Structure 1
Amino acid sequence: VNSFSGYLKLTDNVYIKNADIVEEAKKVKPTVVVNAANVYLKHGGGVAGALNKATNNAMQVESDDYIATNGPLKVGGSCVLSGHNLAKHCLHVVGPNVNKGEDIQLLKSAYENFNQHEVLLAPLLSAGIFGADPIHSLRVCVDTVRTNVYLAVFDKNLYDKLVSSFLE
């Protein structure tokens, strides 16, 4: 149904909210929820772990079956799989992990995958333990994505810092 509410409008197509992506998926019922995935689709912690746990492990079982036949994804790449009880589809997107030496330039490619979907619920790519500068990831999102993206950032201090820096 894509019933997003309580979001700050950053541009004509980019919205942001201090919220848990899992709780947003449950209320909004989006056509697409984006997962901050790794190349082998192992959803053990962070955003991936929260989405997988909200599907009672159905996402991980489906992901293991995909990996068995198709092998790993590439950094900057993506894969559409079922969204289970959280969405119609889950778009698993691999952003670069700069804390593991991955190229930050690939973050533009990661966001480009959002342009295949009219409207998406998404986390801020490569933030958290992936180590990218969150203000830079927001700028790559604004500059790259043309479709409607609703960003859920589950940290009030980070949300306030991003909004303040964007309004400069």
Structure 2
Amino acid sequence: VNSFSGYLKLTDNVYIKNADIVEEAKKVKPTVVVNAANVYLKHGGGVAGALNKATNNAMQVESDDYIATNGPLKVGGSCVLSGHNLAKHCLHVVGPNVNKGEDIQLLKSAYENFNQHEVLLAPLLSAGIFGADPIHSLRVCVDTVRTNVYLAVFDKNLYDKLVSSFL
């Protein structure tokens, strides 16, 4: 049992809610919140910009140290950093960015990172400003993630379309 509330069950292990991931995280304080990261951990926009702002830029400061020590992530890759005031941990996952010409086939590899965590609060990878089709991202999520994933979709119109088109 966990405290996630108001989710619709899509499959045994995938749940979805029309919610602001920042507010979900602040309320639930999950063990893991997923960030829609880029390889440089530059949290400027989309989900990353929102999560970082909610940490008053502490996520960015921590990320800058991570990059100085380790260098960039790979597309499809991830790292675990602090969740600050949002969660115990933040799993920074890099989905392909179609607006950078990156190969959407790497989306499955990106979602595989979720399987290293028994429970996650997450956005749909490669959606929003990353340019991929969110319906396809949800399909890959369902077909890749085996651990328990609670998806937060802020945009109500998109949420409704994701539910109504789910196979």
Distance in 2 separating the partners of 1:109 and 1:2: 27
CA contact (8 A) 1:2 1:29 kept: no
Distance in 2 separating the partners of 1:91 and 1:2: 19
Q: Cα RMSD (Å) of the superposition?
A: 1.0
Distance in 1 separating the partners of 2:52 and 2:130: 18
Aligned to 2:68: 68
CA contact (8 A) 1:107 1:140 kept: yes
TM-aligned CA deviation for residue 45 of structure 1: 1.1
Deviations 1:71-119 (A, max 9, x none): 0000000000011110000000000001211000000000000000000
Distance in 2 separating the partners of 1:84 and 1:131: 28
TM-aligned CA deviation for residue 38 of structure 1: 0.3
CA contact (8 A) 1:111 1:141 kept: yes
TM-score by length of 1: 0.97
Correspondence list, 1:140-155, <5 A: 140-155=140-155
What is the number of residues matched between the two proteins?
Answer: 167
Q: Please identify runs of 4+ aligned residues in structure 1 that moved more than 6 A.
A: none
Q: Gaps spanning 5+ residues in structure 1: where?
A: none
TM-aligned CA deviation for residue 2 of structure 1: 4.7
Q: Secondary structure at the match of 1:105?
A: helix
Q: Gaps spanning 5+ residues in structure 2: where?
A: none
Aligned to 1:14: 14
Aligned to 2:109: 109
Aligned to 1:53: 53
Identity %: 100
